[PDB]
Design a protein around this ligand. Structure first.
Ligand SMILES: *[C@@H]1O[C@H](CO)[C@@H](O[C@@H]2O[C@H](CO)[C@@H](O[C@@H]3O[C@H](CO[C@H]4O[C@H](CO)[C@@H](O)[C@H](O)[C@@H]4O)[C@@H](O)[C@H](O[C@H]4O[C@H](CO)[C@@H](O)[C@H](O)[C@@H]4O)[C@@H]3O)[C@H](O)[C@H]2NC(C)=O)[C@H](O)[C@H]1NC(C)=O
Ligand SMILES: *[C@@H]1O[C@H](CO)[C@@H](O[C@@H]2O[C@H](CO)[C@@H](O)[C@H](O)[C@H]2NC(C)=O)[C@H](O)[C@H]1NC(C)=O
Ligand SMILES: *[C@@H]1O[C@H](CO)[C@@H](O[C@@H]2O[C@H](CO)[C@@H](O)[C@H](O)[C@H]2NC(C)=O)[C@H](O)[C@H]1NC(C)=O
Ligand SMILES: *[C@@H]1O[C@H](CO)[C@@H](O[C@@H]2O[C@H](CO)[C@@H](O)[C@H](O)[C@H]2NC(C)=O)[C@H](O)[C@H]1NC(C)=O
Ligand SMILES: *[C@@H]1O[C@H](CO)[C@@H](O)[C@H](O)[C@H]1NC(C)=O
Ligand SMILES: *[C@@H]1O[C@H](CO)[C@@H](O)[C@H](O)[C@H]1NC(C)=O
Ligand SMILES: *[C@@H]1O[C@H](CO)[C@@H](O)[C@H](O)[C@H]1NC(C)=O
Ligand SMILES: *[C@@H]1O[C@H](CO)[C@@H](O)[C@H](O)[C@H]1NC(C)=O
Ligand SMILES: *[C@@H]1O[C@H](CO)[C@@H](O)[C@H](O)[C@H]1NC(C)=O
Ligand SMILES: *[C@@H]1O[C@H](CO)[C@@H](O)[C@H](O)[C@H]1NC(C)=O
Lengths: 371, 470, 294, 49, 49
């Protein structure tokens, strides 16, 4: 029964991993080269093999190698080496670390391309700078400031991705979650490796010492007590593994949904995967799971201004216009247009508004008529 | 019978599912045993080999318990002339351990040898020294070796030929019989060396001891060319703990340095188990000699050589199996181990291998049954781990391969105003089948009839438990 | 008061050492921060170089329960200078001394009726030969019946004097002349065993424990193993046959001259109770940091 | 509750400040849901919303 | 009593995990169709929200 339960749990883990990696596998991609991102110094994501962020994340987290090359060989001469003393095998992962590297490379070289058109039929590997241009167009920032303010936003994005390397500490809640997940696996194995010393009412934890000290009629009861304790411990471990695997599968489905929503495409959901209005995301592996980081918009230095709901002619009240992805702003340098997330007063044209049905609620105007 | 037998009995059927399975492990056999934590002391025979040996009526005693005695280092010192033993084999006193020993040494020439018998009635067997009736004994009549001066020779051999007690009437005479490990009263009045042959010794007896007078007669035999003497050993089996023992002749196979890097069953004088001893550096308290981990498992030990050692475990390798349905094919795998262990030092039931190349080193471990090949499989069915898989031949053994990565259709990110677009020119409709379990089987159980089955005494017993069914 | 973080006065595990690990350990330990029952020995009266009448406290009239054993610190005031008890106006260099203890399950009054007399078998540990010898003996104690003697008249207390000129002879003090002072009030009868130990002199702090087990009382110290440490270590397994209920300290005198009244040290006594500690076994495994639970 | 002996730990949020959270949500939902993008606040009178 | 406390611990952890999942669901709901007007059918309101 215990072998059946562990085999079923491992098969569930394996095909859940296979399903998640099949879903995240992009159709088409561009090769990763130096100069990726152009002016953006995003080469930390670029792997030159795992990525530098991935290797730094492996280094900064207390991880013991699961003896896949010389585990018994290092046990010949010198916690992972304590694998047989209780009796258990840590299975190797279903995918190679190089297979993870190939998947992460595919996502990093394809995320610039997939994020331009609805539907995954085509692939659109535009240079990364123009991808950011179109994504910031998508959030409601006018093309004038993007045409005029490339250098400062490039420096802002670069320093934003450069600030997180020194933030690799307790403040990163993601590292805290990775750490106690790894600690959860470690203490789950330590439950097996430690409870052998428990006696459960017996006088010694060693069966051989029991048979070498005692007479058979009482060691029958002693061995029975200790094996009953060990079987109850193993049944509790089976239940713990089952509920942990079920939670892992649910989290895997959630991760697949998240990478299918705001990685391959630009989402609009309020803080579903990025606090603030989301712009882009990036994805790497993690020593137990999957690590996500997201770059989003954060406004500052807000100002209050006066605005309307629509411009209508006094002589022709039927002709009414409404702002498209923006607002109608009265400058105090006579109306003008502003974007939905930045203060950029610019003269109102036909390419940013839509003709709309008239109401009393808008403002009649007959002096400075927009085109 | 084999791993597949255990796999079949695990599934309670003749048919199983193809895949990777964990069969019971095996253990490397212990290479031997080491016993080195506490050694005993040696028995003392220097007063036997030194000084003037007293006479046969003055046999001097050495008691031996809890000591080491080696007749190879002891009996070689004797110029052996006469050897007799009763109720014990001659080789047992040099080999078998005993509870306690008593050994009396006395002056005894070879001319008076024939009086040493228990059934004898001569003066030596009457007054001087009598053996043990109910205990096994051994008499050794030896000579001083010519290249041996540490022992000396007395002035003359002497013994008591007539010994008796006269009562208060002075007419009734009672001879004195010496028992085992006893002394005659005439020994008290006969000196350590009788002056000459036929000497008569006398003493007054106290009235409260029956009164009367005490008489004895002593006789002398002069020194020969070299002094001859006698040794008597009486063993005892139930008067002490079986502590006197010979040399512990295991100095070449029960030490730590003799069995480095090999699994042994240590018996460390109170601490026994299975493990591997390795030379290390002195850690922890050197005096306590026993260092353990947090989990009450010993990590090292301080031997008497001054060298500290670490003991980790008697560690072995688990065994896994890969099996395929509808092609009666299987192979064995040992993970996390170099290709170093072959069928020599086994345990548990047996091993399974057919179609007799064998050892194959993979990143998972060492695999028997596979064969190296340059194949790439993207839809593997039997995941061996990492990215390695095996594939049946549709009789032909399993083929090793790596998990084939499906490259996405590559497109070059150009650096100009133009752009290289990927567009599909053909299409299909794919059906994707999914199942969502929305309802478990609404089941009830009638508590009392399940737990009780309608017997009135049972419902009498279950009335006190009460609210569990509710 | 004892600091467990400073790791002063802790019984080491009896046979089970470790290394570089913080381990919980149940056993017999003193409470954290105890003022204890510190006593000080003092020298007798002296006018110039005349060895006069003694000068001690009333420690002999005091008896306390042995309970779960206790530990003793020696020479915590060494490498320093302090006042003399008999000469409060004079301060001399603080000199370490060792105390003598007596152990018994009984109670009773002396011939004059003062509390403190023990009956039947009694254990006495006296340091002799200027502290080099550690004589220990479990005998029957017979009081003497002379002047100022416990079975005689004018009895106040029994004391052990130490004449530095005679009792000791800078090397030839192996004549146990302070056991003679013990004989000058008491007599030994029907004694079971008589044990001595050799310990060299120094001017460094010392710790030892008198605490028992069931089948036999034990003598623990740091002197045998860790001169620079303070950890208890099994150096004697004294085979008593009964559990001792009460302990007491023997007042000790010194017949030094007036012009050379050496200032003595202070020794501290801490009783032990069954608790649990946490210990930090270092790489060498000696206890250097520990903490209480309750 | 103490007869068994167990502390009922109060929640981290009090009544008043969590009520202030709910008041902020009530005052914001009039205007936030009018234009995509969470950057700009749009507190129109509620009938127009 | 220790068996009872072990059962209570297990039940408390199960309820805590369920509460955390419901908390994340409530967070998604309040950022989905409270701060905005979701077009999704019946996710948080029967009929057209
Ligand atoms: C009264 O005054 C005397 C003398 O001033 C003090 O005695 C000295 O105490 C210090 C304590 O730090 C000793 O220094 C220690 O030396 C150890 C090794 O030295 C010994 O061995 C060498 C080689 O044989 C000799 O040359 C040497 O004389 C010593 O015999 C070191 O291993 C020690 O390192 C330890 O440091 C800390 C703190 O002690 C520990 O926690 C570490 O684990 C480490 O083991 C240390 O350096 C010095 O040797 C002593 N000298 C003498 C002559 O005794 C008394 O301590 C002082 N007493 C009081 C109560 O104040
Ligand atoms: C892009 O960012 C990387 C990461 O900081 C910069 O590379 C570092 O340069 C410093 C300067 O000496 C070195 O000390 C670090 O070792 C480098 N780290 C890595 C990971 O290469 C790089 O200079 C930046 N490039 C640009 C153009 O800004
Ligand atoms: C703007 O001109 C329009 C056109 O006449 C006027 O708005 C009307 O106001 C009346 C009065 O309630 C309403 O009944 C009409 O329905 C409104 N028109 C529309 C198209 O809704 C009004 O004169 C002016 N309003 C403002 C605010 O300037
Ligand atoms: C120290 O005191 C002890 C008390 O017993 C003396 O020890 C024994 O003394 C007797 C004399 O009555 C001797 O026969 C024993 O041989 C002694 N035994 C041992 C082990 O010493 C001892 O003589 C005293 N030391 C002196 C006076 O220097
Ligand atoms: C054990 O190792 C120590 C240190 O490496 C070395 O000094 C010693 O000679 C070794 N002893 C043996 C028996 O190999
Ligand atoms: C298996 O074959 C491949 C290619 O022929 C080779 O690179 C590899 O080293 C081989 N492995 C073994 C264990 O023979
Ligand atoms: C763009 O690529 C062409 C090669 O086709 C090269 O000649 C040119 O210098 C490149 N322009 C850059 C890197 O700005
Ligand atoms: C599309 O692919 C199918 C599958 O082979 C083929 O039968 C069909 O002719 C293809 N259609 C076109 C237009 O290429
Ligand atoms: C002793 O334990 C500490 C605990 O972190 C560790 O850092 C140190 O390396 C250990 N010492 C040795 C020699 O391993
Ligand atoms: C202790 O010292 C005395 C006198 O210096 C000596 O007779 C005795 O043998 C010593 N004992 C030990 C164990 O060193």
């Amino acid at each position: 029964k215990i072998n059946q339960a562990l085999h079923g749990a491992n098969l569930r883990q394996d095909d859940s991993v296979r399903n998640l990696f099949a879903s995240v596998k992009s159709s088409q991609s561009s090769p990763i080269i130096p100069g990726f991102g152009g002016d953006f110094n995003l080469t930390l994501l670029e792997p030159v093999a795992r990525s530098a962020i991935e290797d730094l994340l492996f280094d900064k987290v207390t991880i013991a190698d699961p003896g896949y090359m010389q585990g018994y060989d290092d046990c010949m001469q010198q916690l992972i080496c304590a694998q047989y003393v209780a009796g258990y095998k840590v299975l190797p992962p279903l995918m190679d670390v190089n297979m993870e590297a190939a998947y992460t490379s595919s996502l990093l070289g394809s995320i610039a391309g997939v994020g331009w058109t609805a539907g995954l039929s085509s692939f659109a590997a535009i240079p990364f700078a123009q991808s950011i241009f179109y994504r910031l167009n998508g959030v409601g920032i006018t093309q004038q400031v993007l045409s005029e303010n490339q250098k400062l936003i490039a420096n802002k994005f670069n320093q934003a991705l450069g600030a997180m390397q020194t933030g690799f500490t307790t403040t990163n809640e993601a590292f805290q979650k990775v750490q106690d997940a790894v600690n959860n696996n470690a203490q789950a194995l330590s439950k097996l490796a430690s409870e052998l010393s428990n006696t459960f009412g017996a006088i010694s934890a060693s069966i051989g010492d029991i048979i070498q000290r005692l007479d058979p009629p009482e060691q029958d009861a002693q061995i029975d007590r200790l094996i009953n304790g060990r079987l109850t411990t193993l049944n509790a471990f089976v239940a713990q593994q089952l509920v942990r695997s079920e939670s892992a599968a649910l989290s895997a489905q959630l991760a697949k949904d998240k990478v299918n929503e705001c990685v391959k495409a630009q989402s609009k959901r309020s803080g579903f995967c990025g606090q603030g209005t989301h712009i882009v995301s990036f994805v790497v592996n993690a020593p137990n799971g999957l690590y996500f980081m997201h770059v989003g918009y954060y406004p500052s230095n807000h100002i209050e201004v006066v605005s309307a709901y629509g411009l209508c002619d006094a002589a022709n009240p039927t002709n009414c216009i409404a702002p498209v992805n923006g607002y109608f702003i009265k400058t105090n340098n006579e109306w003008s247009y502003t974007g939905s997330s930045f203060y950029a007063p610019e003269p109102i044209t036909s390419l940013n508004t839509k003709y709309v049905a008239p109401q009393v609620t808008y403002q009649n105007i007959s002096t400075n008529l927009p085109p | 019978f084999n791993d597949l037998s255990q796999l079949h009995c695990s599934y309670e059927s003749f048919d199983v599912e193809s895949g990777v399975y964990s069969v019971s492990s095996f253990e490397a056999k212990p290479s031997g045993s080491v016993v080195e934590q506490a050694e005993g002391v040696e028995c003392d025979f220097s007063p036997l080999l030194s000084g003037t040996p007293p006479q046969v009526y003055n046999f001097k005693r050495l008691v031996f318990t809890n000591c080491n005695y080696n007749l190879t280092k002891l009996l070689s010192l004797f110029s052996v002339n006469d050897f007799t033993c009763s109720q014990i084999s001659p080789a047992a006193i040099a080999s078998n351990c005993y509870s306690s020993l008593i050994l009396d040494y006395f002056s005894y020439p070879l001319s008076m040898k024939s009086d040493l018998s228990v059934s004898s009635a001569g003066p030596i067997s009457q007054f001087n020294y009598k053996q043990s009736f109910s205990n096994p004994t051994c008499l050794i009549l030896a000579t001083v070796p010519h290249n041996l001066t540490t022992i000396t020779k007395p002035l003359k051999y002497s013994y008591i030929n007539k010994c008796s007690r006269l009562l208060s009437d002075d007419r009734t005479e009672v001879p004195q019989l010496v028992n085992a490990n006893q002394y005659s009263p005439c020994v008290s009045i006969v000196p350590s060396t009788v002056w000459e042959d036929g000497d008569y010794y006398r003493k007054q007896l106290s009235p409260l001891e029956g009164g009367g007078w005490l008489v004895a007669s002593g006789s002398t035999v002069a020194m020969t060319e070299q002094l001859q003497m006698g040794f008597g050993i009486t063993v005892q089996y139930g008067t002490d703990t079986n502590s006197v023992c010979p040399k512990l002749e295991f100095a070449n196979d029960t030490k730590i340095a003799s069995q480095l890097g090999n699994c042994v069953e240590y018996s460390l004088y109170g601490v026994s188990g299975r493990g591997v001893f390795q030379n290390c550096t002195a850690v922890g308290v050197r005096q306590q000699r026993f260092v353990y981990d947090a989990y009450q498992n010993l990590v090292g030990y301080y031997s008497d050589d001054g060298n500290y050692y670490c003991l980790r475990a008697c560690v072995s390798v688990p065994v896994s199996v890969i099996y395929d349905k509808e092609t009666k094919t299987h192979a064995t795998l040992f993970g996390s181990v170099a290709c170093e262990h072959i069928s020599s030092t086994m345990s548990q039931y047996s091993r399974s291998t057919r179609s007799m190349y064998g050892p194959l080193q993979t990143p998972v471990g060492c695999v028997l049954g596979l064969v190296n090949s340059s194949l790439f499989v993207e839809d593997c069915k039997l995941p061996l781990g990492q990215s390695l898989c095996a594939l049946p031949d549709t009789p032909g053994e399993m083929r090793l391969a790596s998990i084939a990565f499906n490259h996405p259709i590559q497109v070059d990110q150009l650096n100009s105003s133009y752009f290289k677009l990927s567009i599909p020119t053909n299409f299909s409709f794919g059906v994707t089948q999914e199942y969502i379990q929305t309802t478990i089987q609404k089941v009830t159980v009638d508590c009392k009839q399940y737990v009780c089955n309608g017997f009135q005494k049972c419902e009498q017993l279950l009335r006190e438990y009460g609210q569990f069914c509710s | 008061p004892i600091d467990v973080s400073k790791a002063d006065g802790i019984i080491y595990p009896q046979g089970r050492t470790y290394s570089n690990i913080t381990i919980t350990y149940q056993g017999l330990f003193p409470y954290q921060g105890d003022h204890g029952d510190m006593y000080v020995y003092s020298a007798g009266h002296a006018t110039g170089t005349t060895p006069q009448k003694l000068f001690v406290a009333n420690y002999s009239q005091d008896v306390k329960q042995f309970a779960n054993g206790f530990v003793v610190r020696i020479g915590a005031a060494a490498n320093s200078t302090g006042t003399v008890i008999i000469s409060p106006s004079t301060s001399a260099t603080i000199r370490k001394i060792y105390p003598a203890f007596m152990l018994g399950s009984s109670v009773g009054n002396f011939s004059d009726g003062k509390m403190g007399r023990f009956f039947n078998h009694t254990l006495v540990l006296l340091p002799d030969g200027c502290g080099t010898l550690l004589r220990a003996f479990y005998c029957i104690l017979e009081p003497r019946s002379g002047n100022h003697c416990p079975a005689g008249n004018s009895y106040t207390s029994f004391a052990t004097y130490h004449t530095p000129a005679t009792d000791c002879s800078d090397g030839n003090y192996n004549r146990n002349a302070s056991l003679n002072s013990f004989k000058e009030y008491f007599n030994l009868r029907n004694c079971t065993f008589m044990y001595t130990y050799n310990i060299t002199e120094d001017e460094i702090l010392e710790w030892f424990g008198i605490t028992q087990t069931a089948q036999g009382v034990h003598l623990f110290s740091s002197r045998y193993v860790d001169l620079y440490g303070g950890n208890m270590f099994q150096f004697a397994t004294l085979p008593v046959y009964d559990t001792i209920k009460y302990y007491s300290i023997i007042p000790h005198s010194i017949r030094s001259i007036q012009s050379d009244r050496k200032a003595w040290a202070a020794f501290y006594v801490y009783k032990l109770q069954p608790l649990t500690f946490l210990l930090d076994f270092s790489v060498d495994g000696y206890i250097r940091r520990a903490i209480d639970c309750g």
